[PDB]
Design a protein around this nucleic acid. Sequence first.
DNA 1: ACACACTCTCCAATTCTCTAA
Lengths: 169, 92, 261, 50, 665
Amino acid sequence: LREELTLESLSNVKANSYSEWITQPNVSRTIARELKSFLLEYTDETGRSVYGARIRTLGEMNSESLEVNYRHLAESKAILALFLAKCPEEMLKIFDLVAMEATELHYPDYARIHSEIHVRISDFPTIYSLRELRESNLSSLVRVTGVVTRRTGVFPQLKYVKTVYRNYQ
Amino acid sequence: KRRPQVKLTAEKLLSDKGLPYVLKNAHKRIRISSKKNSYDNLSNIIQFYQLWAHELFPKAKFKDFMKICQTVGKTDPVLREYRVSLFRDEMG
Amino acid sequence: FKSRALNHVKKVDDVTGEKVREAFEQFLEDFSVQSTDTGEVEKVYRAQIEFMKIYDLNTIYIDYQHLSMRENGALAMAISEQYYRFLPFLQKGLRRVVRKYAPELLNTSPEQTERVFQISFFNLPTVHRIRDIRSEKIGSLLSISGTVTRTSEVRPELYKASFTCDMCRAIVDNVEQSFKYTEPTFCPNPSCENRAFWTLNVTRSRFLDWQKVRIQENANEIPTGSMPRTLDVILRGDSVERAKPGDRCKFTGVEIVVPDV
Amino acid sequence: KKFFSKESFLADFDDSSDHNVLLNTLRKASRKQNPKSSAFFESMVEDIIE
Amino acid sequence: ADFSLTVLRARIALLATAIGGPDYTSQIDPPPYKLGDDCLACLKDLKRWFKLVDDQQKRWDVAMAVAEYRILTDDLLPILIDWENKCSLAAKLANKAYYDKIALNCLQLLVLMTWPLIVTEQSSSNQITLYGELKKHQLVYKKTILSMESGKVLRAAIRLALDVIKIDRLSRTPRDNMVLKLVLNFFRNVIAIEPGEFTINTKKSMDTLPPNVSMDDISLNTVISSFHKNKVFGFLLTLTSSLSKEFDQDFINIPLLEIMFYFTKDVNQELLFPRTSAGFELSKLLQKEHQMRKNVIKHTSARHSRFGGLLSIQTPDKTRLTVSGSQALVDEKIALQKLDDSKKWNKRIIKAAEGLPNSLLNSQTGKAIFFTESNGKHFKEFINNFIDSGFNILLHSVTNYFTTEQDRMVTLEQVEYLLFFAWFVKYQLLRSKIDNSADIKQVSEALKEVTFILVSSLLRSAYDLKNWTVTHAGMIAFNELLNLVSRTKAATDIEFIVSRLFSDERIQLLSNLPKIGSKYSLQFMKSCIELTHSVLKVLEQYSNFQKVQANYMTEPVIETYINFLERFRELEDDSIKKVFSFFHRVFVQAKEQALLFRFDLIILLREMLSPDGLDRMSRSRKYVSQFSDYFLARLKKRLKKSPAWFVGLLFPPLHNSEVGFYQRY
DNA sequence: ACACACTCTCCAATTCTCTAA
Ligand SMILES: [Zn+2]
């Protein structure tokens, strides 16, 4: 509960699978602290912290999506990049809940503008066409290219199963 | 009430339809021969008893007929009276 | 509580399967063909296992002529005429040998699941036509040739399943599927009786690659006044997307019978 | 008849005689790898200054 | 509460990390583990969590916590193995006490976690809940312990023993002797863990190996290999053989009995003697498969399943029946069988042993366990050296223990003793049957009077209290004593032992035994039959006999014999020879013909003699046909002399005084 | 409303046990 792990302690996956290791409370709190420490601290060679500048422009446009480059996350705290590649569906939940703290540090009461922020990953370093996908790729993050053949109209969709909705296509 | 169950009983055996038919006919029914195999003659003995058992009480499998007969044969006093009567007839 | 053990559980066992298993074991150990250039025993299949260890492969190829000359041909006959019965026993036989000589291959960091080996055969005595498939040959080992006309996209097939109960925290594992999607019969925890609301754990369950292809008879073989028949063929594992439409191919495997699901 | 004595056993006990690339990359990097956050707050404070 | 439970689990995890960890400066990819501090307190507090909390509350929750955090696989084995390898290298060259202390306190936890599991109606609901899952985890423990560096942790345990072998018994403190008990108590648990038994609550009438475990990990064959490479068999052999010389017998000999029980249990002795070979017998088995296929074909119609017409069969008295199918048109036997087969009812049926892992007592032992060539010869070498070296001294000590302690016994120790006796006596008899190099003097301690009295007393007391499992096991042991006596008489005191073995009281007991067997499982009746055969044969070669044989012949024994015989499809070739030996004795020699004139025997001879059942060329058919010919001859004579027996054949014989005597003769 | 699938309930058939002649 109270105690936290070191980053070196996370080098050894101790449970029988990745997802059952990320979801534990102490491990999750350690990952949240390390991601917040990464987001507040990464720099260009000129100093000039890029993500502080991006959070600044997030409110200037009243936007909803923060963008994170994968190469930056791999350049330091590499194990988090590995976990993200293996278990995106959990890692992005934790990352979004950190990103909201980072944005509220700039703009208090930004929750009144938007209630939730999504992290967008960029420059994932491996690519497939639609040939190479196999069953081993299931639940893993992938990067794909092609031509969009057909598009539906936009609809609302029930978010939770008092009610809330989201767009869908 | 639900309909009561139907069972084999000593009254059926002691009926004219029952056991007296076997003693009236078994001397004429079965016939062994040295001229046929042990398996052949052994298969011959069970024909008459199987058909008789079906004619008496078609409920159950043949083994079940025998093993049901064991209980009432050992327990009922009237049936035992009939059997000692048979062996007294031979003592006569 | 009225706890009770399954005292009567002791199973029936097929002796032929075990003897075939531990004879195929010996064949893998000591086929002992001599070298291509010299009179020196080479033991090619152990070398092939070592090759697979070097390159992390998952399939092994066997020559039917090599099996034909082994032990007066009885083992080859048993494998040929009753492939569907004896295929699990061959897998069990190969697993022990790979454990003996290359335990690194048994696994596919956290724990690593087991490798699903594949046995393959080639150089069978004769090739049949699509027109020669007859129901007397169901379950046997065969080889077939024809022209490809269609292919399906690769899809994941559920191989072994694992479920968890909604009304209580209990887990069922290693459920077997065959032709239709199949789910447990009871809640294993006796404190709960709910049969409904299972969910398939995608992480713990295991899948396989699966592809459908369609073939027709060779044009030069069609008899007088007749027209070509067609057939559907299943490909799995490392052989998916190997076939191409319009090409001529030769297949081998076993013919099966599929229900109306 | 055998005996298998103690002293023999004590004496004899001792004397007897592609993600494949990326995984290695990230593992090695992981093994190899308030004033520090001041740049972030500076970017925040520049809105006050400019 | 749940939060208190998870608080204890988190405490156990923080203790599972304070223990220490490997070194990240090392540049050695990976290094071994590296040691923490407060670790004495950590191990001690973990021991307290087992003993002072879990045992006092009867939970197994603490074991679930340590299994969750994988303490055994992760920390204890590398700690012990690092200690072993460090001291090993130091021995190659040829505060250190603190290292030795940590070794001891790691081994004790290893013994505790792998301790075998017992469930009763007095176990807590918590333990009953947790039984099925801890079984899985203990299977994982067995695999992991046998796997690491090809099982090197087992060398540490015997080095701990070697420290206490070292100096004279006259010096050895009680705490010193507890080590020598502990090291064997470890091996008993490592052998004893095996695949689970499924258990459910009988509320409604409607595999457990985890994903990381397989059979070849868990089989006894693996245990033989692992033990041989890690130098265990020498340790057991040298410890048991010199047991007589002032090793304090009290601390060692019962655990050392339990080991020998725990890997004799699932071996048939014929598998260890042979009596391209595999392929040859496989081909022969395929011929047998072809015969079964032929049997199915002979009942298969030529034309398809919807071609079939209809048949009508008319009885005497002109009543008619109806049956379908094409084969019924030609085969009246098949038509008669098929007619009765449609009828729905079957009479529901009555059912003896519980509380003991699987053994000969409650499993069909016509199913071997399978060995590598090296494992086969190594195991043969081990038990052969055991018999030639250790058997008599071990049995003398353990038997002169139990005579002074019989009243205090528990069911485990009785069944253990009785199935150790039997296995080794039988194996020596077979080995000396095979070859002259072996001799029977190696097992001769069994015959001396005290052990005979003790086996007799166990059988007596078990029979009186109606404890049927110990009765079964005592039956098996007493069978082997009689067989060994019949061996030695075929070569002084042995006749005295026979005369005391066959006092009238024992004849009453041994005559009583087959009668109750009718109700029980198949193995019980088979044990009764084989014991009866041996008993009667020994008293045949005593020259009393007519008194004894008339004691055996009556209705309930014949009932047991027929009830056993009708399951012939599951039985061996030999047991049927024994049964028909007994029937020859009853029918021809004793001339008590009236017992067998009962109808359910006449069905059995049809089933067993038909083309359905016993093979056309098996040796059984000689005996069966040669018996049935004479049987029907005498039956013909009896039936024509007195026609009343037609009605007699259905029922039991009639016990009235005045008619019964002429009935029986 | 008309065949089906599935659940629930009660009652008597059966075997087991104890006692005395
Ligand atoms: Zn449930």
